Structures are given as C-alpha cells and as structure tokens.
Amino acid sequence: KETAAAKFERQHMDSSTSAASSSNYCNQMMKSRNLTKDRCKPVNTFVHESLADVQAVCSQKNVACKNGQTNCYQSYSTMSITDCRETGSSKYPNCAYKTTQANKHIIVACEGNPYVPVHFDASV
Amino acid sequence: KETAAAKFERQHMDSSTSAASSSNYCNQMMKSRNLTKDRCKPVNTFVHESLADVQAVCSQKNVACKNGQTNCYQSYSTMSITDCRETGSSKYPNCAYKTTQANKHIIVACEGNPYVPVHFDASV
Numbered sequence: 001k002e003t004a005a006a007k008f009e010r011q012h013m014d015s016s017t018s019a020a021s022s023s024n025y026c027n028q029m030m031k032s033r034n035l036t037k038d039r040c041k042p043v044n045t046f047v048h049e050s051l052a053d054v055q056a057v058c059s060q061k062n063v064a065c066k067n068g069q070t071n072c073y074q075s076y077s078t079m080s081i082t083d084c085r086e087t088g089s090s091k092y093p094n095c096a097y098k099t100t101q102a103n104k105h106i107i108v109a110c111e112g113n114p115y116v117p118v119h120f121d122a123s124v
Numbered sequence: 125k126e127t128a129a130a131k132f133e134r135q136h137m138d139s140s141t142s143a144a145s146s147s148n149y150c151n152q153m154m155k156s157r158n159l160t161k162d163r164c165k166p167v168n169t170f171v172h173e174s175l176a177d178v179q180a181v182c183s184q185k186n187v188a189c190k191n192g193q194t195n196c197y198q199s200y201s202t203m204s205i206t207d208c209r210e211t212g213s214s215k216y217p218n219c220a221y222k223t224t225q226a227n228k229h230i231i232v233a234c235e236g237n238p239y240v241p242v243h244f245d246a247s248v
Contacts, residue, residue: 006185010200016183016239032180034200 004118012120014046018080026084026097040086040095048080058110065121071109078103128242136244138170143225150208150221164210164219172204182234196245202227
C-alpha cells in the first residue's frame with residue numbers, strides 16, 4: 001500500500017538530472033511513473049533536485065495550503081522543475097504532454113515521521 | 125577500461141527483442157556477452173527495455189539492496205526480462221542455461237555521477 005510520502009516521490013521527484021532535456025521528457029516520465037496507466041493525469045510537476053533538498057523544504061517557509069491546512073512549506077530557494085501538461089488533443093490511451101522547464105519555488109505539504117513532503121501544492 | 129556502467133549494459137541489457145521466445149536464448153547470450161569465459165555465471169538477467177527506461181529506474185522507488193546497501197531502486201512498472209539459470213548438467217566450458225521470460229519489476233543498484241545502473245539486484 002503506497003505511502004503518501006512514496007506517492008510524492010513517484011509523482012514528483014526526478015533527481016536523475018537537473019533539466020528535462022527533450023521535448024519528449026514528459027511523455028516518457030509520465031509513463032515511467034504510472035501516470036498514464038488508467039487515464040492521462042492532466043497536470044504534473046517533476047522536481048530536479050536532490051531528495052534531501054526537497055525534504056528540507058519541510059523546515060522552510062510555513063504557509064497555508066490550498067485546502068486550508070497549515071502544514072505547507074514554500075522553498076526559500078528556487079528549484080529546477082518541469083511542468084508536464086497534457087495537450088488539448090491528448091486522448092487516452094495515447095497520452096501526450098507538453099514539457100516546460102522552469103526555475104521556481106515549490107510549495108509542499110509535509111507530514112509524518114520522518115517529516116517529509118506528501119503533496120505538491122504549487123510552484124511559485 | 126570497461127566502466128561499471130558499460131559492464132551492466134553488457135551483462136544485463138538487451139534492448140533488441142521484446143522477450144526471449146526461444147529456449148536457446150540464454151545459451152547464446154551468456155556466451156555472446158562474455159559471461160561464460162572464466163566459469164559459468166550461475167544466474168543472470170537480461171532486460172528487454174530501452175536503455176533510457178532502465179537508466180530512469182535510478183530515480184524510481186528506493187529499496188534496500190540484498191547486501192544491505194541502500195542504493196537500490198525498483199521500477200514502478202513491470203519490464204520484459206529474461207532470467208538465465210545454469211542447468212544441473214551444465215559443465216564449463218559448455219555452459220548450459222534454462223531461459224525464462226517474465227514481466228517483473230526490476231531492482232537495480234545505482235552508483236556514480238551520472239547516477240546509473242551498475243548492478244542487477246533482483247526482480248519482483
């Protein structure tokens with residue numbers, strides 16, 4: 001039974017390399033992470049920093065979450081990210097995404113012991 | 125000097141077939157990849173996925189290695205593989221193998237900068 005922490009890592013961490021290198025990064029990554037398996041997940045962000053650096057966000061700027069909870073944290077620094085968004089013509093089972101690389105702060109919800117990210121709330 | 129990363133590709137990649145389909149695959153491959161030179165390597169697994177799909181596993185689910193180290197990673201999806209296991213009546217230099225094809229999650233050990241597969245740990 002996947003933990004919320006593990007889910008975060010499967011959906012949002014890609015510490016492989018510092019940049020999405022290819023226009024097809026999202027198509028490959030979305031599939032390699034199980035996010036085109038039953039339906040196309042429409043929108044997803046991958047963060048290209050070390051796990052340690054992303055976990056450290058949980059001791060940075062405390063902010064409200066979109067849902068009203070107060071266990072969210074904004075990274076003090078910007079991070080290398082890739083935004084994956086399904087195209088307007090994408091239709092399961094041939095999921096198609098446009099890849100956009102950015103450097104932006106991330107906002108995560110943190111929970112548990114160890115106290116780690118369990119939800120990606122936004123990039124800013 | 126063969127790198128560890130190139131050694132893994134020699135010993136464990138074979139992105140040319142979708143499977144095995146052929147009882148003689150391991151007899152041919154184990155020899156062809158230099159795995160029967162000094163002895164009959166007793167067990168070995170080949171992966172029938174792209175090189176980028178196997179290298180992407182080093183950013184996938186972190187799991188303990190069988191030897192207790194921490195640098196092993198399990199694929200989120202299943203991958204086409206072929207296990208090769210030396211038969212009971214195999215005698216070097218005439219190494220003989222049973223060929224079994226499967227679709228299993230793979231577990232690899234990753235090392236280096238760039239962080240790449242260097243050992244095939246297990247399939248599950």
